[PDB]
């Protein structure tokens, strides 16, 4: 249940009507916040999630609810971007996926974590390998303002 | 008859005068809107369409109209970015094409779908794969404003 | 007890050391979120709070907490910008205060409420009227991204 | 009915819980488009609507529906920003109101119309007089891109 | 005529049907070019024309053409901002009008001329004086790039 | 000649005193305008001409005059960006050259054409090929404003 | 002295050779840092010090050293922006002076303090008063990034 | 003269075609450098020159040259901005003038001087007093980069 | 210690529990300051530290402090970017690490040093070489402001 | 020397503390001007100098001075950027170097030259070839202002 606790169950998929090709979908998510930090102070991020579906696409409404479920969730065991990628992998079995998060600063320093994944043994694994090697080569200017 | 209905047949091509080279043509299209969402609310987006003509070039006034024709159309037999690319592939049989959407937020999230295509087994297919691999590698700051 | 419930009583003031002058203090607050909307979806906003202390100054760590305390609070007996100003007027009895919200879109529209206050019949009241008259005169480009 | 035709009737108000003070509310509306032009080509705008309520506030959902009702409305008799201001005056009887619209260019030129209003004989009329005299003194840079 | 020379004759007006109030119209014209310099080489500017009609509006196609008409016009004895103003004042007999030009560099120097006009002995004559006195108080950053 | 019509003969070169390196030269050209469009209305664009000379360099002043010459020219029996790249190939015989145009919108759509050329059978052709497969991968944001 | 602690005695003046005009001088100071916060962690700010001299001008190099001296100083038994304005009043006896600070965030909130001073009973006090009633009316957008 | 020293004698003027109104001319001058610093080391600014003409207007080429003449000029007993305003005052006997410099950092700090002048006893003197009061109320964010 | 001197000892690590994949972490540190210049005066930069942990993550409070520790530290015989890298390499034994500094102007010149590191004989050694070769291909605009 | 002529002799170098890795040093140089144009008239650029050192690193003050020395220097038979690269090549025997100029408009056009160099036969030469291929693929929007 999405309201008070983390709800990976709230995620819903639908058939990708274009298995025939590589359809690339990105979700800009700037209303992300959670109690993942070890300190209990909330954190705040814009999370960008990009993926190439195989059989399945994720419903955008369910994603929103899913991300809201993190709001008051301070049972952080494994790292939060990963939880997000894992859950979405479990859901769609995608060809490619990545979760990029840009955080508000805490202590004068903002953390931008990044993970991706492509199906083992396919060009999508080369894609993840390539998008890692090339990650964030050209950084937006940060002045804390 | 026209200004309401989806109208893939108002499109028009004309002959490419530089078939010897790869001429790159980008259409920036910030005035795009449709009912494609299942809900019934309309959507809004900047659509970027880049192609390399072979023999036939799409004429811009007709692309304007084609695009306006999505105003009141909203069917999901198929996805709208793909509908757009297909009608364009049908019309032109181009070396390379891509359709990139940047949409306004609903529920806090914005969706930026992207599909491309290149003539099978040609260098253009290699370009499609490559452009997909490097797609949106340096995303834009999206704060909802 | 605290991190869920609306908590106007965690606020704390301390004595102004420059009561002789008009000291202007602006708090930029981009990490704000609440359930104030009647629907139940949360809202997000940058809140700008500007005041001129009289005898009492609000201490920032407590304002941080006060503001976090709206996370799960969402009641509309009264509006949230006004709730915020009132608790602050209660706490400090300041010469001048204003609370300016810039919110994220829902249904395509974004709402930027603004209220101010100045001690009745003083120059500060004149400043309130004036600032309201010149409010947001040079708006910002809002394209939803 | 909002779907196919103009629906000023769709607008709904609720009691302003703060008649006691001047509460300033602004709506950034970038998903505006209509068939108001004399040519039948649609037009596209970001519309900023700001107001100070008296007895009444406008419901934001109804506004959105109201603005959508312009989408396919080519019965343009009187100018479109005015229609919008008038309808909203009829609805709320506000202390102050203004409608500012920034249009996409047509013919290499973009039109930014502006009207406002304050209750006759009050400081709000002086406010409108002042916000007119001062309108758009510092223009954002336009290069059509 | 406007095809290859200065063409006041192409300017056209229509009745302003929102005459019992102050309707502010800005035209952003970033496609302006002429041979106004005495050097015989063209110049380039964005031109901002803002006015408040009395009884008549400028028909904007006609203003597209009128401006176009300046393309191959070697300087009148007058200056081009003022001729633009005069011709518009003749056509319309407006309450208030201004014309502001931002030209591109020559010699490393860009020139921004500004003239206005409020109907003599009205409040708009006071506005003119006001907008003159406040002109460009907050100027854009020029790096020549 | 160089006042009212297309003048390729205005172009002029001078010896590249550095035939031993790849010297990469870029001209940014914001003041470009022509009558190329079929219709006969002007277009407007920033045109970017990057290139690597072999023995010859184009003398900047003549490129200015050359581009000026497009002002009253609309022989779109070829395409204008290709005509430009061509006359420059004819004048220079360069290792590498490209012509990227960014046009202002028309019918709400703005067109950005791009063509290049690297000396055949050399690494420059590899370059033209690569830069074409990488073209405009990280697009500028377009809203028409 | 001027290496590890507060050093007002580093400040230095020189005759204003223009006592006959109002010469308005602004120092932009981005490299400001101190231990002012109660807690003992550093703060960081761009500090803007604008002022109109009477007979004395502050010698820029000494202001650099003066501000440098805050690096290891946290005697918030006064406020640091006021200490700065004060030592400068003490050193200069200026017609007008202000000190606007913009600090990086802490606990997700960034503080911007502002104080000014105009010679009492003169027009400068009118100025201090006006600029204070107009302070930061057109705010910079804050997202923490 | 021009080439290698301070040269006020190089400024021309020409007749103001529009004495019956207030014609505002701004010059944006980003290529300014000199040896005015006490040190001997050069400085670099954008100087913004604005004025309303009475009967004489400054010749635009002379200004470029005049300004070039500061390139190796060191010190009089005056600040460089005032030297500029004085010279321009003598040349044209202007109704209003102002010189606004924005310089590049030295020692972590950039200096922004500003002077102006209205004809004594006129509304122009009221304008100058006004524009000094309103000066640089909304500064750009400075970060040194 | 970190209070007033260089403090590697404060750096702290923890087990990376997402070890069977590549997790990319960027720290934006825009509050960096030290006495690394041999001139004895401080310097100021944003520092971007990006790494891909093997088995251990840097604990980020400890990195806040470590960086803080540089505040009053007159240059090691080494250079400060590399010492930052080494110490982090010692603490963590990472697959990949880079440290990029953007310093503020001195002499009118800002220095951006960049070093990286991929574990010897792994793919990350190839990445290092790659990110080196591609470093800063698309550099930010420096106006010194 | 420095003061009034071209002075290569003014460049120092000092030992590279890090020969065992690739240490990338970028200089951002926005205060560059010279008389290199054929005309005799000056020019203004931001020059960006980047290099990987072998055994010598350039002394940062000498570079400022060296660069100042171009202030009144006219023409050799070389372009100015190459003169800079050559001088820096001689001084340090670098692994990689590149000079990127961005100049201000003359005649509606700004020129952006670029050269580089890797040690012949090394991976650095591969890097230089690579960086020329990838050069300025994503240009900033140029409008002359
Ligand atoms: Mg499958
Ligand atoms: Mg920033
Ligand atoms: Mg074929
Ligand atoms: Mg934003
Ligand atoms: Mg009291
Ligand atoms: Mg935007
Ligand atoms: Mg009432
Ligand atoms: Mg623009
Ligand atoms: Mg610019
Ligand atoms: Mg030809
Ligand atoms: Mg735009
Ligand atoms: Mg004191
Ligand atoms: Mg920001
Ligand atoms: Mg800047």
Numbering used by the authors:
A (entry chain D), B (entry chain E), C (entry chain E), D (entry chain D), E (entry chain C), F (entry chain A), ...: 20 to 164
Share the article's original sentences:
The Glu97Gln mutant enzyme crystallized in the same space group (P3221) as previously determined for the wild-type enzyme and the Cys55Ala mutant, both bound to preQ0. The refined structure contains five subunits (A–E) in the crystallographic asymmetric unit and exhibits good geometry and an R factor below 0.2. The overall structure shows a homodecamer formed by two pentameric subunits organized in a face-to-face manner through coordination of the C-terminal tails via divalent metal ions, similar to the preQ0-bound structures. However, the Glu97Gln mutant structure is substantially more symmetric, and represents the substrate- and cofactor-free form of the enzyme (here referred to as the apo form) as no difference electron density corresponding to the substrate, cofactor or the product is seen in any of the ten active sites in the homodecamer. Superposition of the Glu97Gln mutant structure with any of the preQ0-bound structures (wild-type or Cys55Ala) reveals significant tightening of the homodecamer in the apo form relative to the preQ0-bound form. The most striking difference is the formation of a disulfide bridge in all the active sites between the catalytic Cys55 and Cys99 located in the N-terminal turn of the second helix of the tunnel fold, the helix lining the inter-subunit interface. Disulfide formation is accompanied by full unwinding of the N-terminal turn of the helix, indicating conformational flexibility of the active sites.
QueF is the nicotinamide adenine dinucleotide phosphate (NADPH)-dependent nitrile reductase that functions in the biosynthetic pathway of the tRNA-modified nucleoside queuosine (Q,), a 7-deazaguanosine nucleoside found at the wobble position of bacterial and eukaryotic tRNAs possessing the GUN anticodon (those encoding for Tyr, His, Asp and Asn). QueF catalyzes the NADPH-dependent 4-electron reduction of the nitrile group of the pathway intermediate 7-cyano-7-deazaguanine (preQ0) to 7-aminomethyl-7-deazaguanine (preQ1), the last intermediate in the tRNA-independent portion of the pathway. QueF belongs to the tunnelling fold (T-fold) structural superfamily of purine/pterin binding proteins. B. subtilis QueF, a ~160 amino acid protein with a single T-fold domain, is a homodecamer of two head-to-head facing pentamers, each composed of a cyclic arrangement of monomeric T-fold subunits, forming a tunnel in the center.
